[PDB]
Amino acid sequence: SINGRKPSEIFKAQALLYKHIYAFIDSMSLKWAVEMNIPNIIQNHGKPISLSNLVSILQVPSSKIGNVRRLMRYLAHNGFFEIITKEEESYALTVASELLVRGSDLCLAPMVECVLDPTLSGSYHELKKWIYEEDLTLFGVTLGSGFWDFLDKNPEYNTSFNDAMASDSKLINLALRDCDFVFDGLESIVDVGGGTGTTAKIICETFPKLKCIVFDRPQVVENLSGSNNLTYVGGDMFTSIPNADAVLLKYILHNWTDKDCLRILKKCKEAVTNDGKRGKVTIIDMVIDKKKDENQVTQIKLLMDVNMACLNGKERNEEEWKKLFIEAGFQHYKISPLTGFLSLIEIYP
Amino acid sequence: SINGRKPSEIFKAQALLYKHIYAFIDSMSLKWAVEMNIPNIIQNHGKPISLSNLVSILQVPSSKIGNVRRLMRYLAHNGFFEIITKEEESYALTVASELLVRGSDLCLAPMVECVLDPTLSGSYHELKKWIYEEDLTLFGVTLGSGFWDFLDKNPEYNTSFNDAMASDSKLINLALRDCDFVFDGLESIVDVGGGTGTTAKIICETFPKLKCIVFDRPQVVENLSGSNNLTYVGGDMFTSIPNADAVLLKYILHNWTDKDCLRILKKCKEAVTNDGKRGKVTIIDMVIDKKKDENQVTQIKLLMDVNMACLNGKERNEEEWKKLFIEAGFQHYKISPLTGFLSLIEIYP
Numbered sequence: 001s002i003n004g005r006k007p008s009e010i011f012k013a014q015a016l017l018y019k020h021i022y023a024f025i026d027s028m029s030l031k032w033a034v035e036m037n038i039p040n041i042i043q044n045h046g047k048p049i050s051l052s053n054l055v056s057i058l059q060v061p062s063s064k065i066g067n068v069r070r071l072m073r074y075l076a077h078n079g080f081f082e083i084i085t086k087e088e089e090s091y092a093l094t095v096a097s098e099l100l101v102r103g104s105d106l107c108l109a110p111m112v113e114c115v116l117d118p119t120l121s122g123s124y125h126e127l128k129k130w131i132y133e134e135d136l137t138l139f140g141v142t143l144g145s146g147f148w149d150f151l152d153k154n155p156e157y158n159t160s161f162n163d164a165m166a167s168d169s170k171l172i173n174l175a176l177r178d179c180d181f182v183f184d185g186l187e188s189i190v191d192v193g194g195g196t197g198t199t200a201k202i203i204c205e206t207f208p209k210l211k212c213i214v215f216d217r218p219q220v221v222e223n224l225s226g227s228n229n230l231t232y233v234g235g236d237m238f239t240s241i242p243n244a245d246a247v248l249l250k251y252i253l254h255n256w257t258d259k260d261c262l263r264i265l266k267k268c269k270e271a272v273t274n275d276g277k278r279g280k281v282t283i284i285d286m287v288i289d290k291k292k293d294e295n296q297v298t299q300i301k302l303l304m305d306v307n308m309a310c311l312n313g314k315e316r317n318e319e320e321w322k323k324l325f326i327e328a329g330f331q332h333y334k335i336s337p338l339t340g341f342l343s344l345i346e347i348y349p
Numbered sequence: 350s351i352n353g354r355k356p357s358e359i360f361k362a363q364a365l366l367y368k369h370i371y372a373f374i375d376s377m378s379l380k381w382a383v384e385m386n387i388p389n390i391i392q393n394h395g396k397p398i399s400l401s402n403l404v405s406i407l408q409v410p411s412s413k414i415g416n417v418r419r420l421m422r423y424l425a426h427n428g429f430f431e432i433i434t435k436e437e438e439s440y441a442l443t444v445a446s447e448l449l450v451r452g453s454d455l456c457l458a459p460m461v462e463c464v465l466d467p468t469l470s471g472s473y474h475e476l477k478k479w480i481y482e483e484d485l486t487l488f489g490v491t492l493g494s495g496f497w498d499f500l501d502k503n504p505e506y507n508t509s510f511n512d513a514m515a516s517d518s519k520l521i522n523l524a525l526r527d528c529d530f531v532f533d534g535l536e537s538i539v540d541v542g543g544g545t546g547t548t549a550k551i552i553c554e555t556f557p558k559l560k561c562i563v564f565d566r567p568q569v570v571e572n573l574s575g576s577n578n579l580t581y582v583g584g585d586m587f588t589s590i591p592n593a594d595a596v597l598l599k600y601i602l603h604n605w606t607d608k609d610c611l612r613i614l615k616k617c618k619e620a621v622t623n624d625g626k627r628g629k630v631t632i633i634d635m636v637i638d639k640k641k642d643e644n645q646v647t648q649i650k651l652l653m654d655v656n657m658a659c660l661n662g663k664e665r666n667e668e669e670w671k672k673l674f675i676e677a678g679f680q681h682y683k684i685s686p687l688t689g690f691l692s693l694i695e696i697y698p
């Protein structure tokens with residue numbers, strides 16, 4: 001016996017341990033496929049590509065052709081390619097690698113590249129130091145400033161981040177604009193942390209009479225010009241949010257601790273309750289629901305929750321969301337499914 | 350439809366993509382558990398540990414207790430802890446986390462730490478540059494020298510590596526010494542790339558009449574002193590291997606390309622065929638066998654094969670091994686299972 005167990009039981013446990021020690025290879029191989037432009041090469045080929053044609057296009061040295069084959073077979077087994085064998089081995093796209101093809105409705109390749117930046121993803125080697133920090137975020141530990149300040153000083157990172165945020169924007173924004181219950185009766189809305197206006201443009205295109213303010217950090221909105229009913233305001237959501245009939249928070253609250261979310265939600269409440277008005281706040285973020293979601297979906301949401309250590313953020317379940325809303329002085333809330341992993345939450349002051 | 354597919358099909362593919370983009374979190378969370386000494390804490394506790402007692406021992410700030418809980422639940426779901434719920438949530442070890450407990454027959458925690466070094470594991474961000482190198486290894490790209498030269502210049506790395514190699518040594522070495530077919534009739538053996546003599550000591554303890562030479566790089570064996578029939582020789586296996594009745598190659602050939610393995614095997618053949626003798630070479634390494642191994646085992650071996658990009662190495666199947674042996678001028682070979690992932694291969698000149 002080994003470790004008080006049958007050798008066969010130990011071998012099974014060793015296999016599990018190795019799967020996890022080496023899990024980073026799943027990430028790194030996927031990154032490599034995107035960096036080598038393989039999904040687009042195959043799409044452009046118009047049929048499954050032979051290994052010989054693939055390496056010919058890539059112009060890899062002959063000494064590394066077998067390494068390409070090994071990586072392709074590894075990716076295929078993970079579900080990113082289909083191997084078809086005739087005279088030669090060939091590689092076809094799958095639905096998952098079709099998500100990496102430029103100029104698709106949903107092209108998520110920019111998310112792969114942003115998340116797997118060596119410095120950002122490398123930050124996760126410092127979970128131990130981070131867990132001992134009373135206040136710092138994981139990125140605060142590794143980058144030497146807060147994340148938003150870091151983006152302001154590093155334009156290539158700012159671009160990578162913006163592209164990653166844009167990569168699922170059409171789908172979410174279109175699902176949002178199709179929610180008439182959100183926009184019925186509004187005369188104005190402020191998109192708090194609204195970025196470069198990606199969401200707001202779709203809103204304005206849908207509802208040409210609606211006043212829309214894109215609100216974000218001064219550096220984010222500097223030099224952007226609005227049109228007719230769309231304007232940009234630079235500011236700090238922790239200090240003052242412009243008055244409107246409604247606030248939108250898309251992918252905002254999951255970036256912050258409960259304490260910081262409280263501060264934001266207080267400013268949002270103020271924005272929608274000026275001069276006797278009683279507006280509302282509309283939130284787009286994940287809602288964890290272990291009882292109702294499919295297990296695989298719950299698992300991804302739990303993973304994202306762990307990933308949010310980067311900003312001391314959180315992916316919240318309904319009880320967690322409710323506790324925030326009550327502490328922030330909102331009277332009631334409603335949660336609806338929106339698209340994929342995301343819900344639409346409305347709160348009423 | 351999205352990307353020519355039903356939205357539900359796209360959501361399933363998105364979940365797969367996210368699993369892989371974020372796979373590195375599996376590695377990083379495991380590393381964190383080891384760095385925080387959690388498996389040992391639980392072992393020493395003697396029963397499953399409550400979250401409150403765990404965080405008390407760790408002395409984490411109160412603001413990060415929930416983060417500990419989230420990480421523990423993530424690790425538990427992966428199989429490294431069992432959650433037991435009564436008045437509180439508590440965490441028990443599993444067979445897999447028992448592999449991380451100091452002073453077990455098989456303690457693999459040093460392997461977790463060596464593999465997941467930020468610089469070594471971070472090298473895998475450079476698969477693209479590496480694939481375009483005619484000669485360089487992945488570590489050669491990122492470390493700016495060959496790996497063995499790097500260890501010679503960086504003692505903390507050399508220590509980490511040695512500890513990682515030691516972590517499964519007892520099991521393998523004991524399985525080896527129990528193979529009487531290997532040692533029957535030998536008067537001498539040279540352990541080529543034999544390290545600090547870990548294997549050779551077990552051999553000599555088992556077979557006190559057998560002459561054993563531990564052969565490795567000068568820096569590795571400098572200052573080591575042998576006893577009775579165990580000696581150390583510093584050298585270069587690419588240039589000259591000391592004469593003996595047999596050569597052992599434990600975890601050697603998987604570190605090299607086919608071309609380099611040929612060079613090594615030629616020197617091994619020379620070592621066992623001096624002065625009319627006809628000895629043999631004994632190899633300990635993985636043998637991939639998709640037809641015969643359990644699928645989960647094959648998957649780990651294929652993963653290790655991908656991982657060996659670090660040194661342009663390879664985990665070989667039987668046809669691959671055979672082609673090397675034939676090209677190196679050996680007449681016949683035999684493969685036997687040894688322990689866990691490893692086989693024992695004997696080749697005859």
Ligand SMILES: Nc1ncnc2c1ncn2[C@@H]1O[C@H](CSCC[C@H](N)C(=O)O)[C@@H](O)[C@H]1O
Nearest residue numbers: 165193194195216217235236237238250251
């Ligand atoms: N103090 C602050 N005030 C206003 N915006 C802030 C802020 N701190 C961060 N942000 C903004 O919060 C956003 C989070 S990313 C989400 C952006 C956008 N709603 C989208 O869906 O693409 C960024 O644009 C960031 O600049």
Ligand SMILES: Nc1ncnc2c1ncn2[C@@H]1O[C@H](CSCC[C@H](N)C(=O)O)[C@@H](O)[C@H]1O
Nearest residue numbers: 514542543544565566584585586587599600
């Ligand atoms: N040119 C060379 N000549 C001799 N040994 C070499 C070598 N290049 C690398 N090595 C050795 O090959 C070994 C690979 S690691 C395996 C070590 C040992 N057999 C064990 O099982 O623990 C290292 O000890 C390394 O120093």
Ligand SMILES: O=S(=O)(O)CCCNC(CO)(CO)CO
Nearest residue numbers: 145146147148149150236238260
């Ligand atoms: O968000 S960063 O950490 O990059 C910069 C600090 C921002 N501070 C706030 C203070 O209220 C929020 O913590 C906003 O100005």
Ligand SMILES: O=S(=O)(O)CCCNC(CO)(CO)CO
Nearest residue numbers: 494495496497498499585587609
């Ligand atoms: O192995 S390293 O890359 O760290 C150093 C180079 C060793 N060169 C050899 C030449 O025969 C093998 O490639 C051995 O001296």
